[PDB]
Design a protein around this nucleic acid. Structure first.
Ligand SMILES: [Mg+2]
Ligand code: NA
Length: 356
DNA sequence: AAAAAC
DNA sequence: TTTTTGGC
DNA sequence: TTTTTGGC
DNA sequence: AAAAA
């Protein structure tokens, strides 16, 4: 009966009954995000997440009673939306130059918060003027980001994600016959669209060399066919005999690659006959496959509340590699996502219920 | 991790 | 040396 | 009141 | 911005 403040203790399908409220809270979170007002940003995000799990639309202020993450500021937003069907706060943010520049500049692959801010503070307002500016120097990611801009901003659909899955699975199984290839991210949560297509690769019997070489063989096979538009392969920092290892980087230790793939229309169930698609591939050691899966399934809010619940409710440390129990002073082993949920004392949440 | 400015 | 970006 | 917010 | 310490 009582709604939990943690996303990992809620079932969130893609059936959002409160889209008008959550859309406005998403804009307010992004406005605080660009301003590096971390706490306020996370408060708007948490409020947007809890409303997504509601099995009914909020139609009055009496409806907001007993729902956690909703304080006086979020309540005043909700109240304003009930009044005329619009959020004057969100509308004011949408028309803001700094907000518009942020959304526009970060929409380029390889441009984040810091580069967007520099460009806005430098007086840039449009992508054409950034691009043609002879004094600016672009990174390799930004160059690909500008080169495939329109394909990359158009969201990957389900028949495209399915065509990419067929391509990824065929290539991996060719070079490693026993490989387990699982599509992760948004598409595993049953989303119909996404910004990219995420995968997790693992093998029960690959040697250390075969395991490290798989992403190199698979990306070289595609480069031979002219299908690899962008490729960044990040070597693993995962040392089995040196666990845990606290990183300055928020990303995990696994060997992974960020790609841009040329996807022929002939593979999807006209124009130039192809589409540039962002594809992420993660290679993990076989014993870590459940933590890697849980970690890469998402959503982002589901993941951060799993960690927050592990810390503050269970005195445990969860990441994409392991589950550490600080009281018992032991790592909790798991060969499935169900086992991780059971170790945390959480009822199992299906991937399509993690859309927090 | 990798790039890149430095 | 440094910062910035890439991911859920 | 200060601390925490993914010790990502 | 909201909840816990
Ligand atoms: Mg994704
Ligand atoms: Na970007």
């Amino acid at each position: 009966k009582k709604i939990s403040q943690y996303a990992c203790q809620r079932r969130t399908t893609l059936n959002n009954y409160n889209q008008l409220f959550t859309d406005a809270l998403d804009i307010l979170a992004e406005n605080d995000e660009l301003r590096e007002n971390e706490g306020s940003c996370l408060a708007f995000m948490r409020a947007s997440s809890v409303l997504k799990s509601l099995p009914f639309p909020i139609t009055s202020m009496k409806d907001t009673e007993g729902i956690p993450c909703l304080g006086d500021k979020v309540k005043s937003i909700i109240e304003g939306i009930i009044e005329d069907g619009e959020s004057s706060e969100a509308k004011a943010v949408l028309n803001d130059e700094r907000y518009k520049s942020f959304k526009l500049f970060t929409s380029v692959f390889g441009v984040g918060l810091k580069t967007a801010e520099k460009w806005f503070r430098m007086g840039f307002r449009t992508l054409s003027k950034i691009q043609s500016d002879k004094s600016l120097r672009f990174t390799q990611m930004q160059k690909a980001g500008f080169l495939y801009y329109e394909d990359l901003v158009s969201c990957v659909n389900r028949p495209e994600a399915e065509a990419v899955s067929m391509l990824v699975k065929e290539a991996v199984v060719t070079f490693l016959p026993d490989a387990l290839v699982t599509m992760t991210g948004g598409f595993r949560r049953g989303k119909m669209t996404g910004h990219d297509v995420d995968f997790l690769i693992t093998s029960p019997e690959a040697t250390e060399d075969e395991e490290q070489q798989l992403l190199h063989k698979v990306t070289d096979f595609w480069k031979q066919q002219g299908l690899l538009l962008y490729c960044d392969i990040l070597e693993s920092t995962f040392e089995k005999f040196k666990q845990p290892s606290r990183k300055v980087d928020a990303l995990d230790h696994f060997q992974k690659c960020f790609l841009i793939l040329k996807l022929d229309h002939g593979r999807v169930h006209e124009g130039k006959g192809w589409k540039a698609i962002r594809v992420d591939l993660v290679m993990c050691p076989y014993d870590r496959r459940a933590f890697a899966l849980l970690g890469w399934t998402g959503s982002r809010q589901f993941e951060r509340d799993l960690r927050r619940y592990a810390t503050h409710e269970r005195k445990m440390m969860l990441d994409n590699h392991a589950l550490y129990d600080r009281t018992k002073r032991v790592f909790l082993e798991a060969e499935s996502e169900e086992e991780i949920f059971a170790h945390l004392g959480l009822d199992y949440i299906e991937p399509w219920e993690r859309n927090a």
